Design a protein around this ligand. Structure first.
Ligand SMILES: [Mg+2]
Ligand SMILES: [Mg+2]
Lengths: 144, 144, 144, 144, 144, 144, 144
RNA sequence: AAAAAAAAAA
RNA sequence: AAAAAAAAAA
RNA sequence: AAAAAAAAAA
RNA sequence: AAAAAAAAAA
RNA sequence: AAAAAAAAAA
RNA sequence: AAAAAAAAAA
RNA sequence: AAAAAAAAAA
RNA sequence: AAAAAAAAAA
RNA sequence: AAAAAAAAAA
RNA sequence: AAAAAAAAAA
RNA sequence: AAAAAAAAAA
RNA sequence: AAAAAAAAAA
RNA sequence: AAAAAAAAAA
RNA sequence: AAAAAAAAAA
């Protein structure tokens, strides 16, 4: 390959976009209480911590969750996800449980193409339930 | 395809990165004076206007330039690029000229793999010369 | 095949969901008045009569309608469907007519993937018009 | 694919059923005492918690069990299942044991076609034995 | 081919629709001010001038824009499009620039299937920015 | 497929037409008297009820007719069509009869390419005769 | 297949045996002391608990052992098996050790065809040694 | 990958 | 997938 | 290995 | 016959 | 399955 | 798809 | 056309 | 020779 | 293995 | 050249 | 059409 | 894609 | 013989 | 020999 700078025979000015879209896998944690569902805010996806503070909308594709702290004594960890949507919330409770007391419980869900619209900060992604005080989420989405 | 939310049989917690790299084509303009070279600052690449204010380093791959305003009376536009490098500046003057007085002049250069290291805000990319008061640049780079 | 109970070499605890989705064909009737459009409520889809009272949302895929009572004297039955959507109602009037005075008139419409979002009890599916006092609907949908 | 609503050339009124059958995997827990067998009631399968309260009968296909709490000190978890049938109870004691003290014990059994008849709330599925105070069951069945 | 009228052996009365959908490419202009974004109203798509006054909803598929008047002295034309959506506005600024001062600048964007829902008169399609006082749009859509 | 908005590399301004042609199947009814021919006016094809009020001309391709009300006592329905043309009316009487007293009679005719010219509101399509007080027409035409 | 009882064209009285042989995998536990070998009695294989109380002889094919309780503090479990035979005891000490302190240690041995003779209650199968107070055995044998 | 239940298509 | 024991079929 | 987003090449 | 949802198997 | 009209792609 | 009547073409 | 029940044949 | 139950192997 | 009667499927 | 919408044919 | 970055699948 | 000049490799 | 830099051609 | 109109057949 070349070891020096070389000329580029540029043509006309191209189509440009200073603020493009971005497909990402965003990791963040949420605090969870015993027997109570926690509504995950879409606003958590927009942050300088993820280089996404310039976005105001996002299209969520999938959600994965893991328990982030140990479970109560004698128990195995569990985590549940209930998808939420502006056009109508679901009543599914996708659940994962650990089979070793020292291991994380995990589960996830995919959003179908027909339900992949935008969401803003004030919207919620899903409800999280667990016997662990913290849950780690990894959300696959398209910032736009 | 599916019309409803479906379960994802998630496994162990994956490797994650909240602040990934980003390959981009960044468009911006610079002011140019007659007979004077303008040093293009790398700092112009880091801005909320490009969603890149969270980065402090960038690896430039190629630089393309176009005249952005009309040339002086009776003249055809021209633009020249002189690559700059922290390990030693080049003396090449890659030039493009218009063949129609109403059209932009354009030129570019590719940086070879061996010279693709990082640059920070205080560094300069290249020197620009033109008979036009403004030059539009489109820089292909890897933010990291 | 086996005539006795046999062991299952079960492994780790699986992913579970006590409240899954359900693809259905829901039959119900609506009362219709001469020259007046009847707005079909989505709420009619949630009922113990269909085993769907545990759901609060549904994604409608297609709607089919049949006249359920005889038409006025000297006439042939007819039924019209006008799709309704939260993002904007349609002005289509899909119509079917009977070709035998003693036979039902029928028609239907398919909702495209891009318009297959959720609906809740307070929403309406479509407007029904007919010269018959009752119309029988069969709605293909995904409860979630 | 289509982006708009389209007509369906519906024919005669079809055969319908407002209350269909449903093949499911039902997860629930039972409390177990040391040295005592717990009779699992079929009634636990009918609940609004599973969207099955509209059913009064079910055909069980298979039963899987996991210990749901930690075992006594110095021990490895174990779980046993004894199939029960209205025409004659079995004396099999299908057992699983953990090989790591921190892991669940698991086992299951399949019901042969010849023994797949209906069961009602007052009937029992099987007897559960364990050294753990709770057992998690996942029953594969056909609600009708 | 036949030179006279011929009989058609018609059967039963067909399914009919007096008010069908219509796929179109709608051309219209908007006034634009220096440094200010113009919100393009969906209402502009419904007009007797396009034979679309009978529609109240439309599904936009793509938007293309061209500068419609000459740019300021010494400049090249430019046009920018920022997609707007009821579920969340985008922050993309798709841009085109002219490479000849006497030529139009142009750009466009495609709406993905998952975001192709209906819009009504009060909704907005996108924001337009330009250095030209007028922009000509051609919107590909499905009236319904 | 894409889940986000994407750029379109638009070129020059295309050829456009705000008021295009439209191929349609138009359904409407006419009142018919015993032993009297009813001249079907072309004007009935132009109406807001069909989204065609912006057109003033139409090219008819084919005409189909069905009896729309029951026939007199003891009789079977019948319908006759006599094509009319500005350059010379036909004397054909294309006829259909029912073979069941409760069923519609139907018939149609195709206009040959050589006779497919435009017609305006004041023109007539055909003459209708029937023993039924109403006839339902479905006219295949090209609005222009 | 048949849904009713059907005739069997039986012939002469067959050879019969009310008390047949049985190939089994028998699970049972033994108590073990630190630094002391435990002689496993063959008599443990004959019990109503295994449905084998009607047998007085058995041919052992293989022996597998697992530690059944946790090991002493700071240690990994271990289990050793020394085969015993009426014609001459072996001096082999087949051993397994755990590689995780929370996991069972396991080992086994196969008896060659030439040493597969019968054993009665008063005979011993093998000697067991372990640092765990209990060992779980699974013996593959032929009851006769 | 096949099969069973609900749905859709053919 | 083959083999051994019980059973069934051929 | 294919696909989607950004980029580059053709 | 294929596909989508629940389940089962591989 | 082909064709005509509107649209999109190539 | 073939044939018969009128017409046209070859 | 195959299968199940009764019968017949082989 | 195949299948079902228990076991073993792969 | 085919056929006849009843049934089921196609 | 394929596809989507309206129409026509098969 | 291939490749690089982010993502998804296998 | 080939060739000429400088360089590198073979 | 291929490749890299400058040039030329296609 | 094909096609168009009327008829008949398939
Ligand atoms: Mg009848
Ligand atoms: Mg471990």
């Amino acid at each position: 390959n070349s070891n020096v700078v070389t000329m580029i025979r540029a043509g006309s000015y191209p189509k440009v976009n200073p603020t493009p879209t971005w497909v990402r896998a965003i990791p963040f944690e949420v605090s969870v209480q015993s027997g109570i569902a926690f509504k995950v805010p879409v606003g958590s996806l927009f942050s300088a911590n993820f280089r996404t503070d310039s976005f105001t909308s996002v299209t969520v594709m999938s959600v994965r969750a893991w328990t982030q702290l140990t479970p109560p004594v004698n128990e195995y960890s569990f985590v549940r996800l209930k998808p939420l949507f502006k056009t109508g919330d679901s009543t599914e409770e996708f659940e994962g449980r650990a089979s070793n007391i020292n291991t994380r419980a995990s589960v996830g869900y995919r959003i179908p193409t027909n339900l992949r619209q935008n969401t803003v900060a004030a919207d919620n992604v899903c409800e999280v339930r667990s016997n662990c005080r913290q849950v780690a989420l990894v959300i696959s989405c398209c910032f736009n």
